[PDB]
């Protein structure tokens, strides 16, 4: 995600918003103020942010300067948001424009709040930090520890139920459904949860528990209890999970094939 | 569902009312505003999806009108909703009155907030459609995409984390439970979605993926990852799921259950 | 848990609060309403739950009133709370402060709720109890329904999709995760709920169904759906799920390894 | 105001609506869901005053269809509201649009406002009357008791700190400013306000108490303090008021002439 | 006030409560929150009071606290309020309940809000005092400085428009109509604001301006603007003011005779 | 007001601040948010106009835009608040810091709002301006028309009815409190209300009408009535008003004395 790429995506979020202007005039205002009169997605991110986290305790307004703050310290959280919005429009087929995520899917602003909350712990604002955690759960139904690390091109469709905790990491270019914990095991510190490299596809319902890890390229079929290492390029499925076959694909998270015999 | 029955409905609707209301001071206004002064279960309906969608992008108010507007062209939606409410209080122990599930339960907001946006789909708002589905998803917990064709006498208990997708068929009178997905595979459009015929219950938990058949009467196991169609009358469990048994009715949604032996 | 201890669980919750002030200005005015105000823990606990619990049908200063005349009649669930805080900050590695469990996690607050609405239940007070069961469904993401006899010593880790069903009983000390279903079988009405006893731990994604007993000590693997009887000290997992060994502890509800194996 | 006229009325305000839409992309939304949508003033009409005089006590959607159900029993008043924009935008030189009072300004507001309450206090509807009066006078800051006799072709302009008591009575054709008061005197019921008959002009901050005529136009000046009747077609002025000439036009109300010499 | 008859005003106000239920079922859960569910009128003004005054800075439930408090400690701004209720009833025609103040007039709120700011000024805490002198005069529209001395038995009928400042005094028994000043003169600190003694009535529009008396049982005439001292039992008119009669009655704040003739 | 005078004013506001959140502990938060987070006036008055013009129809974080917008184009705007901030602290000795008129007196907010709503008037942005108009006037109860042209140095004490129409004219170091109305005549647009010159102050309820001069350190009397053009250094006062002296200051705007005989 270059600069020059980061300015097409805002340009092509635009361009889309001046045909929803004219498609919904119930919603004509809402994509003004969301899209049409920002002239950066870092933005249009703060703006978006800033409303659906707010709430009595905390209001939008206060939120959008905390949040502009982090962006302004690292510019970089943008352009990973920036590919989570291309990740989401190439790996889902119900979604057809950039904007759409940005504007709508509950799934990519838990993941642009996550990445507020873990710049503010590494940051020592563990408390407020812990806060937006809690709110995002609530408000989003995806509940991510802020010193999970994650990275950018993730797609989190639907995303109800998804829990990641605290030792959780998460490479670039993961796909992950709707009610998937990565998730800890036992009551010390430590390292304790999955570390899920790049490529991996993980399906819906799939707990994956412990400090274990799952290879680069790997596919985790839906509904599946994964207790062991699934080694890179491998699709691992079922209660509990062994080794099936392997995908067809390098990058399983790019085409999104949710079959398990292989 | 024809138009007699439906006034029954909504007599017995109001005979309840009055009773909760003379039961419960503090809910008697809610009770009167929501129920006692409506004279059909149309008006009460818009009244009820109109203050739970409501958001500031969008007012109570005029939601409402949309719902007016949408039950005034296609009059049959607040019929299958009363067939929706007759399915929860026939299916579901927990609910011994036809007012239950309009007043307070989430799938049942959910399934005709879907209704809403189906239509708004099919006259070409799309973008409003697409604005709907997700406020339902942060607001019930349930993702429905618009474009489902989705039947009547459908109770979807509990429902948090139910996901049904864009090219998902879901025939008259069938049951499902929290946490399915009526799920996609692959990265491209067109039909892969399940299609659920008439008379299938699905226990919480299933993962039912792609444009595979589930057929009439099949009964689905809660936490079953069901990837190949299976035929009428079956019984499917497993992670992968395979058919283990035939259910004891014809209908499984009608009679509830959950056992999988068959 | 005595009052004495229960003091000292309320002197640790305001000490934290008086740092937590100092650290993060802009929650300060916050942790000051509803931790350092207060003189006991049943008081932080009524305003969490009234501002929590606040809608449009009923605002937080009514519901306060409701929880206090709860709280005033049966002194003993100020007391549960106590010990669903500490078995949080016992259990859960990502929880080292008692006051963490009442500011910010929503299977505490769904808890402590359903508490409310079970005394409300057991009063006649039914409707009020319904009401509120699914509004902490839609709010929390966690249905409980208010007949359910839930003990104390309780964590609902993450917690959602939590559903517990009319008849279900939780004695003391069980640790569940999210997507725990303890849920029902058939249309009638009647016992159909899981028995869980003392010590059993449930990890994510478990559904277990019918009246069936799972017996103290005992543990469920995480995605497992039970559907015999499970016995004291003994580990099921699968789905659907078996017996496959034994817990290294007495309860395993304290320690939350989640293998199973043994 | 006939039902030919009232539709032209209504066709400016809409066509005044479609430029306003286009030209402040903003309330591009709050046109079309106020003006655009509606089919007639009556619906228009709903929607402002629900929306305007919502509370936590009552929210719009309810306070709609009891402005809906008093316009379907007495239509006169719509026909009184398209009168009452008239008089607005042909006597006030702020205003060049019809929509303008409908849209914006609260006297206008709180003078339909008065309708219903009269309307419900007639009916037998006190209690809900005195509510909406005293919410009228937070929200607007314009006092009228809804056992008030108010006719059509009203301006209130400005309005801030009108009080109109119990027995007053202002026929059609009259303009009113700013911190006027038609007040009782005494302590006991039945007439004790003024009568203000047709055609009657009511300068800024004027105060005319007790049971006291005031004829038809008859002009009263700013600041005045009428105690005593007013014949037709004079001007009154002074505290305490003196008769201190007679206005240029036989309605003054009309040509807002606000000098007083005569 | 004493403690016997206090019992009565609120036995008053309930019975009244039960009869405005069965009256108005659009408010009956509005009764029983506000009214019927406290057991005395300290209860029911805390309530009041924190709905009314809420804001997003400060929560009704936050408010409820800092005025409960007050009232501990000083329990005779109760008794005051309870005289100030009676005086509205006695005095005002258009309220013959006792409920009637307590739930709708704003300048009996503002009043008792002015009690509480007043009692947190002399506590040191001024910065609050002042946040909710503000907050009133927004709200209500009435602007009472925190340092004003206020009696008992006050009438401010309609309101709108009151302003009180820093030094002023307002003995027991004294009836005040919207939109009168008792002002300041100068830029300097110190004496400068009305004294107004028991008994005296004061006209809509009346300006008193600087540190002068306006004597027992003194009439103000309503638009005048009193520059000098109005000896006891002397009627005020004019702008500026001369005496111009004396009233017919001892206490002219009993009858509320608004003619000045005398 | 220069660069360094602007930097000195905000330096007071923030060290006021600091002690403002050490006294208040429920307000920490807000003094944190409104004053300590921001580096200058303008920033913090964008925040407190931004929160204060929210609504449904314009929430906080849009509203914001639109005033740092116009701030960015014309800098004045926050020296002109900041000389404003000073008329109030010098001028009204309820006042005691520069805090005060930020974080609380309407009177102030609205005159900030007004010139937001006439720079947007000036650009052609005149419906949102008129919005803006109104809203002010229903929130603040202040009611200026956009096109009004109003200097800075300006006191709007109490505020409460202050009425200012469409060609009037208000110079530099002016005072004026609640009730005054600025107003106009006839019904024809054009020129028509008050040229109020510098140095004038204008006492309580004071209307003037029609346009005509009120000439440089006039005073106009509380209560009074103007229909004839002032002088420069001179008094008028009566209903209507004449001249009566000569002021005793040569900007009576700056000293406040009410006193007119002299």
């Known amino acids: 995600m270059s600069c020059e790429e980061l300015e097409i995506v805002w340009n092509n979020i635009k361009a889309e918003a001046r045909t929803l202007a004219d498609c919904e005039p119930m919603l004509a205002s809402f994509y003004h103020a969301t899209l049409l009169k920002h002239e950066n997605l870092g933005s249009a991110l703060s703006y978006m942010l800033a409303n659906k986290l707010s709430s009595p305790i905390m209001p939008a307004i206060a939120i959008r300067e905390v949040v502009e703050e982090a962006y302004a310290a690292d510019p970089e959280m943008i352009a990973s948001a920036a590919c989570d919005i291309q ?5 889902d087929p119900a979604v057809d424009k950039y904007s759409t995520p940005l504007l709508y899917l509950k799934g990519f602003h838990a993941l642009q709040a996550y990445r507020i909350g873990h710049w503010l712990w590494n940051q020592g604002r563990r408390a407020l930090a812990i806060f937006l955690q809690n709110q995002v759960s609530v408000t989003f139904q995806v509940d991510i ?14 995303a109800t139920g998804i829990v990641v905790g605290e030792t959780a990491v998460i490479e670039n270019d993961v796909s992950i459904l709707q009610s998937v914990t990565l998730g800890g095991t036992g009551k010390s510190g430590g390292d304790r949860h999955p570390k899920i490299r790049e490529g991996v596809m993980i399906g819906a319902g799939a707990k994956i528990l412990g400090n274990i890890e799952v ?33 067809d694909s390098d990058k399983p998270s790019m085409d999104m094939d949710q079959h398990f015999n292989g």
């Open 145 to 158: 520890h802020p010193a999970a690390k994650i990275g950018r091109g993730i797609m989190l469709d639907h």
């Open 215 to 247: 290879g680069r390229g790997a596919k985790i079929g839906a509904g599946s209890v994964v207790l062991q290492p699934v080694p890179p390029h491998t699709t691992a499925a079922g209660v509990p999970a062994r080794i099936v076959g392997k995908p």
């Open 87 to 91: 990740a989401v429009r190439t790996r």
